[PDB]
Design a protein around this ligand. Structure first.
Ligand SMILES: [Mg+2]
Ligand SMILES: [Mg+2]
Ligand SMILES: [Mg+2]
Ligand SMILES: [Mg+2]
Ligand code: NA
Ligand code: NA
Ligand code: NA
Ligand code: NA
Ligand code: NA
Ligand code: NA
Lengths: 173, 173, 173, 173, 173, 173
């Protein structure tokens, strides 16, 4: 039953990786929803839409990289349903950015817990995988989203549609 | 409530489009599963894996194009859960190709039903959208998968692992 | 006696590094033996020979990088005999690949033990050296060798000399 | 009061980062002093001066990268006075190199203590930041300075002004 | 004790040059603080941050040019502590620009006093050094900062965060 | 048992070739040891280190060429342990060069004995192989090392560390 390649790879780590794969796919789905919310004719923020579509694709890349890891270590991928996002209507550029920030912080928390498990199971390869490919990426993403939220709020989002328009143009464009 | 852009776009068409979006996302997820099945160290058919990963990305593109359509017509996207694929282990290159063929024929059937609904609701834009972007794509995909299955079977798949190896090399490589 | 550069570098780490240097040189010698086994006129698998020669040179590079590390930290290199490989005749492409997989897993195990020692001695530089340059390299190498073994077995190695021939051509060529 | 981006970032880590920022700025100031010591008409070792000026700028870069980290994690930078270097007159190329070696080892020790704190606070992002950008840089710098000191001493520095001249020309030039 | 190169270089001029070196280093430190204030996630004015970082580096260049002068004339550099800036939090783009203007005017005043001393000591080389490299630079810098402050105030800074955003984009970007 | 390619290839020649393979691998190991001796922070002669590393790689090439010969003639390679070098610490550039000269002369002597055996066994192919690829290479290497030793001694090695420094720079650099 044991993969010929498997070495120092705990069942708990394999399961946590599968959970992280699902979470990354969920994040991709959330960002896709946000993108096409901004593509609506009654919202019409093209650069918001583009930004979130980019994020969706990036999240899919993260999921695929975790799947690759899983196979590299000799674990077995078990996929689960990708839950629909919490909202169909994201209300505003500012609200979408805040929800994105919350999502990214949740993903970061799950990654940190994964790192903690890896450390406890003395899996330095897994630890450094997480460190190299995920943790700094998350920190950067959270910082960027926080900057976006800060700017939007100072500009007067979400009540200032001019604010969101100009943010779309000058920051995201 | 009615979108300022909406014209000649029936609620039934909007709902059917949302269903097709979900089906395309499901197909993408299935192909992703198949790809990483072939990336396993105990399967190790790199070109099968690449082929199905390409298919996964193509299906994602199809879903995104349907979402774009939905917004173009003034319908509203409602996402649902993306169900996990029917299998974690796809058993063989031949079996994966046969399951892909079945999936593609199911997608084609749903597209045909969508076209029929569009026709009944006198939505020529929707009809020609389906015709231009989806129906021929499906016909080609089904023909290609059928060719693959035919070749594999004649080569001796799935019992001939040499067969699958050489197919991976010479057709998919 | 203490090197002017030495800082936070435990004697146990220095000794373990010297052992790892020897192990890498041993692995380079094993791969050299395998290469020239496949260069024999009665074996004549040129791409197997090339693959293992490449592996031999890579292992030499790994040893030299460990020696460089040793000097960087202010430890002192102590070389030992490089033991001859376990076999003169590696019997088959499949058997050589399986022995290579076993060797790589042994090297990986020694690296993991080195990492564990580094961690206990609170040597984060050494830990990250191992993580960056060795652990992922090992994981990749083990995965690749496992893929090779899987393919060969499915093709019918080692009884199918046609199998090994075609593997030599299409995978390693 | 808590930054919207802050996650898994302990107050003790924030304070230690601020201390490291100050230490890096101090090191920059020390190297600047050494550079312009060698620019004196009664010392006149242009390549020593250039080497230390380069080191000063590198140390400034290190400080700025720590400040960037601080903001990325949602900590707050608190600057302190940059103390003047211990010497105005560094006496010789050899003495300056030895003082530089001592400084680099002190910076390395502070970084190691920072890593230890990060580890205890389960901050893998901070740990890997330190590992990636600082620890190996320090090891290299210490090794290089040790090489310089060794060469100078063997050449006959600091009593052999010919020694220092030729070192300036052939190593640092 | 007297440098072989020293000619027509008064002790008072040497001391004043050392004071100016310290002041330039202080200005560099102030601008660095301002830059990283604007890099905060709760401020997030990237082009303000870039502008002040540029100013910091320019001030360092000015200090280094004064040190070079000091050695050229045969004076001896004596470094002092670089005091921390007056603020950790610069409150706003407008407030930072006003503080920068005040700092630049203080630096200009010190340069003018240096020129006056040089003139009194009949040091035409020192006078023309100051004139060529510093005084016009200061005049330009003060004019630019005044323009920035004027624009920000007219736009509605610091109460209009939209004002500061658009200034960051269109003037500093 | 006899190789299909074997012709005019005596068992004594095959055994002598295996011995020469081992000797070349030993020489490679010796040069590697010397290289990393010179890479030590307390020796720090980078160009000595580079020179001996080059020699190590050249010796490995010589061994591989002998292994290729062995297979070409239909002999069978039998590897033995590679003994550790006689020293961990080579004391000086001059001493290392003298030991290298001694090693090269020993290798040359073994090659000459191999040639003598080949001649007695009327193996003109083997004779001309040795002549073409090895004997002149050895003569050149011995001459070069003798030149190095001569220069170092005249410069004042090993007591003149300035001597070794300048040799490292001007001859080996
Ligand atoms: Mg049509
Ligand atoms: Mg074929
Ligand atoms: Mg790490
Ligand atoms: Mg001849
Ligand atoms: Na992610
Ligand atoms: Na499709
Ligand atoms: Na290795
Ligand atoms: Na530093
Ligand atoms: Na200035
Ligand atoms: Na040789």
């Amino acid at each position: 039953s044991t993969s010929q390649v498997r070495q120092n790879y705990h069942q708990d780590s394999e399961a946590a990786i599968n959970r992280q794969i699902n979470l990354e796919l969920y994040a991709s789905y959330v960002y896709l929803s946000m993108s096409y919310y901004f593509d609506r004719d009654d919202v019409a923020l093209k650069n918001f839409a583009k930004y979130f579509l980019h994020q969706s694709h990036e999240e899919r890349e993260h999921a695929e990289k975790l799947m690759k890891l899983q196979n590299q270590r000799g674990g077995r991928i078990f996929l689960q349903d990708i839950q629909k996002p919490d909202c169909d209507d994201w209300e505003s550029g500012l609200n979408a950015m805040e929800c994105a920030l919350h999502l990214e912080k949740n993903v970061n928390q799950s990654l940190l817990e994964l790192h903690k498990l890896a450390t406890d199971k003395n899996d330095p390869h897994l630890c450094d995988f997480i460190e190299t490919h995920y943790l700094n990426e998350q920190v950067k993403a959270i910082k960027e989203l926080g900057d976006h939220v800060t700017n939007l709020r100072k500009m007067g989002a979400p009540e200032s549609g001019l604010a969101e328009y100009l943010f779309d143009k000058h920051t995201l464009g």
